[PDB]
Design a protein around this ligand. Structure first.
Ligand SMILES: Cc1cc2nc3c(=O)[nH]c(=O)nc-3n(C[C@H](O)[C@H](O)[C@H](O)COP(=O)(O)OP(=O)(O)OC[C@H]3O[C@@H](n4cnc5c(N)ncnc54)[C@H](O)[C@@H]3O)c2cc1C
Ligand SMILES: Cc1cc2nc3c(=O)[nH]c(=O)nc-3n(C[C@H](O)[C@H](O)[C@H](O)COP(=O)(O)OP(=O)(O)OC[C@H]3O[C@@H](n4cnc5c(N)ncnc54)[C@H](O)[C@@H]3O)c2cc1C
Ligand SMILES: [Ca+2]
Lengths: 316, 296
């Protein structure tokens, strides 16, 4: 049913170690929990090749293997894991609404756990044309570009999957990569007739008229840049900034850009928590992110059950 | 037997072990001073199922063993030693154990919250009552002593006292049936199903059965802070107070894990505390402007 699929006690945005640990604890509290994860390969832990300082996990382990263990634990105890990119929130009421292309999820408690693989929109025109042709969510905006020209910037798992989303609609998908993509999964993407590869090309500028983007300026390997007509530009370059765009300035931020939280990981908005590297503390380690998620889950259990005290989850 | 270290960590639970793992990986000479590896909260947990990244069935002391092994693999020195006192009055902190005086540029308090508040027990602290048999054992040669409790610390501590006392009167709430080694000693008198009503003594303990030393090893839920003797600020709830980087009111001294007595008493939270402290310690000891993450 609609209520079964979309209405939860706890909605967690982001499935890195913070979000998965939070879900493990809320699910073990028998709170109906969903993780909305845009791409399990895009988080900081998932891209770590070999993690050797996660306490309790010895030997050689890849980050994406460690994360898979954590995700499987959360699901084992009842978490619903969904591939879904959150692009907006309505935080003004006791029931929070969470907007994805897969539908609107609702939660009595909301957890922001999207990490800090983001970047400031530094390409000239990029900030200027946000919402007017510049986008970071192909599953949300792809359908608006049926039979239109689009540009995808970046070489990483997210860019490849988002480019494939856009091949379902666009007349042409211009893929701008800094290096040779052959370095599958590229093969599958490059097999789409609409994909045009621009290897070793840099995106110089995004331009348009008042109505929105009309072209990009690019420089590929001769002293003179060229203009490429396009109406949608999807940029998937990785950075070190907290991923907070979809929050639309609705929670307080520290001067460093991270989400501000109190001692129980609660943001400035009641019923909304922030955990892991979205907080942009200096202590960017997987076990610290996991600890944040645990604290938030314990605070959420007290809040949703109106308990007098935090209740630890102890084996006896 | 070196006693000088860059970082001294008091307590080898998940907080202390994680801290050591990170400071050692930072190339800081690190020692863990652990009174009993079986006495921490994680070590007594029979099956932990909510430590993220460790699926399936695991005993608490096996999880701790992995963490301890990780810290040592990257260079930590692990020592069995009970801290009974501290000198924090100088930049190099001094840590007193029966095994010697350890010193460190940075000190970490990581003793957890298996402690208990003091039946006349408090009145006689330091005269008759004691909580460190490795410190006071020699003082009770050929004297009657009482040991209270059935747990890893009590059995090990009772065996220490058999080396000196004329009689070891062991008060247990239930049948002890490492107990076999202890009960085989001729000086051990077992008082099963016996509860200690009170402690009585003179100005100089004298009884509770006549005795002169009473060693109480009952488990509780209170932060273990007696050995700090009020030298760092404590929260109204009894926990050690720390700032955002886990630093106490004394610069160069950190507090991590359940010694802080926050409501969030979970192994992964304690481990996270230890990581934060280690990163702050690395910045402090190298006079860095910024925290340096440890990334592969
Ligand atoms: C190169 C590198 C190496 C590292 N090495 C180590 C190491 O050795 N040891 C260690 O302890 N730490 C290491 N770290 C740090 C550690 O990986 C991070 O601190 C930790 O992963 C942060 O956890 P997090 O869950 O907050 O976020 P992340 O792990 O980044 O996960 C965030 C999740 O949110 C999702 N997401 C983002 N936006 C949205 C959205 N709008 N809607 C839905 N889902 C969304 C992403 O897809 C991702 O799955 C490393 C980091 C980097 C960048
Ligand atoms: C019955 C019970 C069940 C639990 N179940 C779970 C669970 O299922 N999941 C979970 O996440 N958490 C659980 N916990 C909580 C978790 O175990 C604790 O929060 C965590 O162990 C605290 O870690 P810590 O390092 O701060 O200290 P501890 O793990 O208590 O360790 C402290 C260490 O310091 C040593 N020490 C003490 N005094 C001194 C001294 N004077 N000098 C030197 N060394 C000293 C001790 O010997 C010990 O080695 C449980 C706790 C209890 C009590
Ligand atoms: Ca704080």
């Amino acid at each position: 049913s609609h209520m079964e699929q979309f209405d939860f006690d706890v909605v967690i945005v982001g499935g890195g170690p913070a979000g998965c640990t939070c879900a493990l604890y809320t699910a073990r509290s028998e709170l109906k929990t969903v993780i909305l994860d845009k791409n399990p390969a895009a988080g900081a832990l998932a891209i770590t090749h070999k993690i050797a300082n996660y306490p309790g996990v010895p030997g050689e382990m890849s980050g994406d293997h460690l994360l898979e263990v954590m995700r499987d634990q959360a699901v084992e105890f009842g978490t619903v894991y969904r591939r879904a990119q959150v692009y907006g929130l309505d935080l003004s009421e006791p029931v929070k609404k969470v907007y994805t292309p897969e539908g609107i999820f609702t939660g009595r408690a909301l957890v922001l756990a999207t990490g800090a693989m983001g970047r400031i929109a530094s390409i000239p025109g990029e900030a200027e044309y946000l919402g007017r042709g510049v986008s970071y969510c192909a599953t949300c905006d792809g359908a608006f570009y049926r039979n239109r020209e689009v540009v995808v910037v970046g070489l990483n798992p997210e860019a490849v999957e988002e480019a494939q989303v856009l091949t379902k609609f666009a007349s042409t998908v211009h893929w701008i990569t800094p290096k040779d993509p052959h370095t599958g999964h590229a093969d599958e993407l490059l097999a789409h007739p609409s994909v045009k590869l621009w290897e070793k090309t840099r995106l110089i500028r995004i331009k348009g008229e008042e109505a929105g983007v009309t072209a990009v300026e690019v420089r590929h390997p001769e002293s003179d840049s060229q203009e490429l007509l396009a109406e949608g530009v999807f940029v998937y370059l990785q950075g070190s900034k907290p991923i907070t765009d979809f929050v639309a300035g609705q929670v307080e931020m520290k001067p460093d850009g991270g989400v501000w939280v109190d001692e129980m990981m609660q943001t400035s908005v009641p019923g909304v928590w922030g955990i892991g590297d979205i907080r942009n503390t200096p202590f960017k380690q997987a076990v610290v992110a996991a600890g944040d998620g645990c604290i938030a889950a314990m605070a959420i259990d007290r809040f949703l059950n109106s308990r007098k005290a935090i209740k630890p989850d102890w084996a006896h």
